[PDB]
Ligand binder design. Structure first.
Ligand SMILES: Nc1nc2c(ncn2[C@@H]2O[C@H](COP(=O)(O)OP(=O)(O)OP(=O)(O)O)[C@@H](O)[C@H]2O)c(=O)[nH]1
Ligand SMILES: [K+]
Ligand SMILES: [Mg+2]
Length: 423
């Protein structure tokens, strides 16, 4: 039955490198071989809804995706190294020849030139019942940040009534791009206006999880980091793709999360991280891990105060435990002062476990501690802007110093909304 289809837009180096892990997970969950485009078997094919992310053509399955960058190397090198040539196919690529040089404004203005072709591919490919778009991107560079922002604006304006969700990577605690505060503030200002829900990650938190929860001995490629983002993307959409007692769609989760129109910035977490612990944990233990800052995929100093939350239970779930632990969650986790004791929780329950695991819980948290995360971004921004450092090539590409300032001040207003709710 037509409907509920999603189109995924990958933007810049990080956004497309993350794409590899996402589509690899999606294919595996649906018993599809990403190298052949085919089901691995009829016998292991499951009752599912492949069409949420996958297009079934006579020849096989393809991603409902666009692979977008202003320079070609990250995508081409990725496609060759991972042998994705028949899945990340050429008609799905929108690649130019010179990057944005880590400047948001260059990503935004150069990206305008490619909007016609992107809109044409969208209207050429998508079904009428498309429910919305996911935009995958980093905020610290210039293409994912500026072109990603432009895409968020363009899609929301071109397709009112469809969802626009962003999966957005914040810079690490010490930034690895000195321009990142400018790019991050400009991006979050744009997404605050045009996105319906912004799910955030940062690399400090992701490395900590991989090193301390998975105990990987070394991280040699971003694939050994991005898999965590793929996992969050796949699990929160699982009840759209597999049977379950209690399903939920994109705007349903946003509606439950967004208490005030500006509070749309979400911290995700998942538990457990391994197959062995999924066999040896309870629903209570997994939820408590999700609410613990060790499992937050944004680097936070503490639990903060939860305004609202979405919990996806996947796999071999005792429904009576899922409900019975609700009072323990409301008692043991700090919620914002205005949250009623009986509120702040939204449940999805899906019978399909992630690959190899017995069960898994994913948490999306609308948490006041994002004000601390954003304040630290703002402090970095101010240390540059107050000295007029690095502003020249924003100005040359159409972002005036006044524009930088208004983006900063609107960013500050969102921070203050979260801090006021915190109490
Ligand atoms: N988690 C994660 N972070 C990434 C990845 N690739 C880049 N980054 C981070 O993203 C930021 C740099 O952004 P890029 O994606 O390289 O920039 P871009 O969008 O391609 O834009 P330009 O190169 O400036 O044109 C830095 O903070 C990197 O550490 C990735 O694949 N995964
Ligand atoms: K770069
Ligand atoms: Mg790049």
């Amino acid at each position: 039955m037509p409907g509920r289809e999603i189109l995924v837009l990958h933007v810049g180096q990080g956004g497309n490198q993350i794409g590899y892990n996402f589509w690899k997970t999606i294919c595996e969950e649906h018993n599809i071989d990403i190298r052949s485009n085919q089901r691995k078997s009829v016998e292991e094919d499951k009752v599912d809804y492949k069409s949420v992310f996958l297009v079934e053509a006579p020849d096989g399955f393809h991603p409902r995706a666009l692979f977008i960058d202003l320079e070609p190397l990250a995508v081409e090198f990725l496609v060759k190294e991972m042998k994705l040539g028949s899945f990340f196919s050429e008609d799905l690529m929108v690649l130019s020849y010179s990057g944005a040089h880590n400047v948001w404004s260059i990503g935004y203005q150069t990206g305008k030139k490619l909007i016609p072709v992107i809109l044409e591919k969208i209207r050429d490919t998508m079904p009428e019942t498309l429910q919305g778009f996911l935009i995958i991107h980093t905020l610290g560079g210039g293409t994912g940040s500026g072109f990603g922002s432009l895409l968020t604006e363009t899609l929301k304006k071109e397709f009112p009534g469809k969802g626009v969700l962003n999966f957005s990577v914040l810079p690490s605690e010490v930034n690895d791009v000195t321009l990142a505060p400018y790019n991050t503030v400009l991006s979050l200002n744009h997404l605050s206006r045009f996105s319906d829900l912004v799910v955030l990650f940062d690399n400090t938190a992701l490395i900590r999880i991989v090193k301390d929860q998975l105990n990987y001995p070394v991280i040699k490629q971003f694939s050994d980091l991005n898999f965590l983002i793929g996992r969050v993307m796949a699990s929160i959409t699982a009840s759209l793709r597999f049977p379950g007692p209690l399903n939920m769609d994109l705007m349903e989760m946003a509606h439950n999360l967004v208490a005030l129109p500006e509070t749309k910035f979400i911290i995700p977490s998942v538990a457990p991280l391994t197959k062995e612990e999924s066999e040896m944990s309870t629903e209570l233990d997994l939820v408590e891990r999700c609410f613990d800052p060790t499992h937050y995929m944004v680097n936070c100093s503490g639990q903060g105060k939860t305004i609202s939350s979405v919990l996806m239970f996947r796999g071999n779930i005792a429904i009576e435990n899922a409900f019975s632990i609700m009072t323990d969650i409301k008692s043991n986790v700090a919620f914002a002062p205005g949250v009623h004791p009986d509120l702040g929780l939204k449940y999805g329950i899906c019978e399909s476990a992630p690959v190899d695991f017995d069960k898994e819980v994913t948490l999306l948290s609308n948490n006041t501690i994002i004000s601390e995360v954003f304040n630290r971004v703002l402090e970095r921004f101010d240390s540059l802007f107050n000295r007029d450092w690095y502003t020249s090539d924003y100005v040359n590409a159409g972002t005036s110093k006044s524009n930088l300032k208004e983006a900063r001040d609107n960013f500050d207003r969102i921070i203050k909304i979260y801090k006021e709710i915190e109490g």
